[PDB]
Amino acid sequence: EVSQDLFNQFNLFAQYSAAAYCGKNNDAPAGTNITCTGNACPEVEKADATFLYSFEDSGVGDVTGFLALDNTNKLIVLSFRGSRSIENWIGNLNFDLKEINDICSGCRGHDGFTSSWRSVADTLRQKVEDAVREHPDYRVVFTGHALGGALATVAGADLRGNGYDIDVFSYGAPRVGNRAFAEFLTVQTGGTLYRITHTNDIVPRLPPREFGYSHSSPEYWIKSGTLVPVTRNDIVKIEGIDATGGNNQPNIPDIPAHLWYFGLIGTCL
Numbered sequence: 001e002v003s004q005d006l007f008n009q010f011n012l013f014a015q016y017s018a019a020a021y022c023g024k025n026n027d028a029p030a031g032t033n034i035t036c037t038g039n040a041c042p043e044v045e046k047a048d049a050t051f052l053y054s055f056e057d058s059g060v061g062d063v064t065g066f067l068a069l070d071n072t073n074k075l076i077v078l079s080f081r082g083s084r085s086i087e088n089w090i091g092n093l094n095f096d097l098k099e100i101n102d103i104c105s106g107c108r109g110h111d112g113f114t115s116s117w118r119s120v121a122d123t124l125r126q127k128v129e130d131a132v133r134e135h136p137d138y139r140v141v142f143t144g145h146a147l148g149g150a151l152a153t154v155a156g157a158d159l160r161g162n163g164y165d166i167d168v169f170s171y172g173a174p175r176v177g178n179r180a181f182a183e184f185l186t187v188q189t190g191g192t193l194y195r196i197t198h199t200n201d202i203v204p205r206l207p208p209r210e211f212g213y214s215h216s217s218p219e220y221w222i223k224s225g226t227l228v229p230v231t232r233n234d235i236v237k238i239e240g241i242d243a244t245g246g247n248n249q250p251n252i253p254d255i256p257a258h259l260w261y262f263g264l265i266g267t268c269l
C-alpha cells in the first residue's frame with residue numbers, strides 16, 4: 001500500500017515515460033502540446049503540457065526522448081525512451097562496469113548507460129537549467145521506462161546539487177551500477193528516486209548481481225498482474241539494498257510483465 005498521492009504521481013510519470021516511445025514526441029517543435037496515440041498518456045494530454053525540447057538519436061546509444069513543460073502540474077519533465085532501435089540494444093550489451101568516480105567515489109556504472117548519458121549531458125543540462133530559470137517554481141522530474149529509467153537515474157545522480165531538486169521515477173529499470181553506486185543512490189539528497197518494478201518483469205533482474213550490479217533502496221513493487229489496472233493497494237514499498245521481497249525473487253521471469261506499468265508502455269509507435 002502506498003498513499004494516493006504517490007499512486008497518482010507514479011501513474012502520471014509512467015505516462016510521461018510511455019509518451020517517450022511515440023515517434024512524434026521525439027522531433028516535435030517547441031511549444032506544441034504533448035499528446036500520445038492510443039491510451040498511452042491521457043493524464044499528460046490533460047495539460048497544458050508542451051515540448052521544451054524533443055530529441056532522437058542523440059549522442060551515443062541513440063538517446064531519445066523529450067523535455068516537457070507541464071503548466072498544470074508545474075513540472076519540467078525529462079523523459080528518456082527505453083529500448084527500440086538496434087543501436088539501443090548494442091548499448092545495452094556494453095555491460096562492463098566503468099568507473100564514474102566523477103559522480104561518486106568508488107562508484108561504477110553500466111558502460112553503455114553512462115556513456116550514453118555522458119554524450120548528451122552538457123546539452124540536456126543546459127536545457128533543463130534554462131527551463132528552471134524561466135520557471136523557478138516548477139518541479140524537475142526525470143523519468144523513463146527500462147533503459148530510459150536507467151538513463152534518468154544516471155542523469156539524476158549527475159545533475160543533483162545544482163540549486164534545484166530532481167526527483168527520478170524509473171519503471172522497470174535494470175540495475176545501473178555496483179554496490180557503491182547503489183548505496184549512493186539510496187542516500188543521495190536533493191531529490192528522491194522512485195524505482196518502480198512490476199511482478200516478475202525480467203529487466204530489473206539484469207544485469208545479475210553476479211556481474212557486480214546492485215539495486216538501490218527502496219523499491220516500489222507493483223503486485224497486480226499484466227493487463228490488470230493498478231490500485232494503490234497493489235504497490236508495496238520494499239526496503240534494503242538488493243532486497244528480495246519484490247521483483248528480485250528466485251522465480252521464473254516474464255517479458256510481457258515488462259510492458260505493463262499502470263498501462264501499456266513501450267508500445268507507442
Ligand SMILES: CCCCCCCC/C=C\CCCCCCCC(=O)O
Pocket residue numbers: 081082083084092093095145146147148174202203206207208255
Ligand atoms: C528476454 C530476455 C532478455 C535478457 C536480457 C539480458 C541482459 C543482460 C545484461 C544487460 C543488458 C540490460 C538490458 C536491459 C533492457 C531494458 C531496455 C528497455 O526495455 O528500455
